Design an enzyme around this catalytic site. Sequence first.
Site, mmCIF file in Angstrom:
data_model
loop_
_atom_site.group_PDB
_atom_site.id
_atom_site.type_symbol
_atom_site.label_atom_id
_atom_site.label_comp_id
_atom_site.label_asym_id
_atom_site.label_seq_id
_atom_site.Cartn_x
_atom_site.Cartn_y
_atom_site.Cartn_z
ATOM 1 N N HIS A 92 0.849 -1.337 0.136
ATOM 2 C CA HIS A 92 0.170 -0.071 0.009
ATOM 3 C C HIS A 92 0.845 1.321 0.089
ATOM 4 C CE1 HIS A 92 0.254 1.738 3.983
ATOM 5 N NE2 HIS A 92 0.348 0.591 4.327
ATOM 6 N N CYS A 93 0.334 2.302 -0.619
ATOM 7 C CA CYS A 93 0.698 3.433 -0.677
ATOM 8 C C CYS A 93 -0.419 4.355 0.211
ATOM 9 C CB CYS A 93 1.075 4.312 -1.823
ATOM 10 S SG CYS A 93 -0.167 3.961 -2.919
ATOM 11 N N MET A 94 -0.722 5.674 -0.352
ATOM 12 C CA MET A 94 -2.026 6.328 0.383
ATOM 13 C C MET A 94 -3.328 6.009 -0.292
ATOM 14 S SD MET A 94 -0.329 8.435 2.397
ATOM 15 C CE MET A 94 -0.989 10.078 2.737
ATOM 16 N N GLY A 96 -4.093 7.107 -3.563
ATOM 17 C CA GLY A 96 -3.833 6.733 -5.143
ATOM 18 C C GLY A 96 -3.335 5.504 -5.450
ATOM 19 N N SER A 100 1.322 2.091 -5.488
ATOM 20 C CA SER A 100 1.082 0.577 -5.269
ATOM 21 C C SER A 100 0.492 -0.106 -6.403
ATOM 22 C CB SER A 100 -0.184 0.658 -4.223
ATOM 23 O OG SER A 100 -1.305 1.164 -4.599
#
Length: 148
Positions: A92-94, A96, A100
Amino acid sequence: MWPSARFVDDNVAFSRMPTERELDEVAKDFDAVVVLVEEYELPYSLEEWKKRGVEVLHSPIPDFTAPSLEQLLEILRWIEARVREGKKVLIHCMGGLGRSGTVAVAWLMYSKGLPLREALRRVRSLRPGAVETYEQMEVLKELEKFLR
């Protein structure tokens, strides 16, 4: 199952950031997490995973940017190491899905040998918006040339 995760194979999924009340929910399904954002953009310490026994790869990628090829290969090798030991991995990132989604496409390319065009189509069928930028596309093209 934590319903925000989308699996690209039996063992590797990608998602938005889990919130603090979702960490047990993620830990139940995933024994390792790849965290693609800097600590400054997290709303809790990555120590939260350590006390749950969840293995963490922290490899930040700035917002709207691509990992270097070397960074991407390091991430892929780590995911493979965890999958070899039978763990499930969440990327995961944020919110967006550029960063990812790039890693998720790369994982299909790296682990299954899918060509870029098919890996891209597959991940975008899961989340339209995976791989946001031309630079993210370009590191995937570099990965393809490396793999062959």
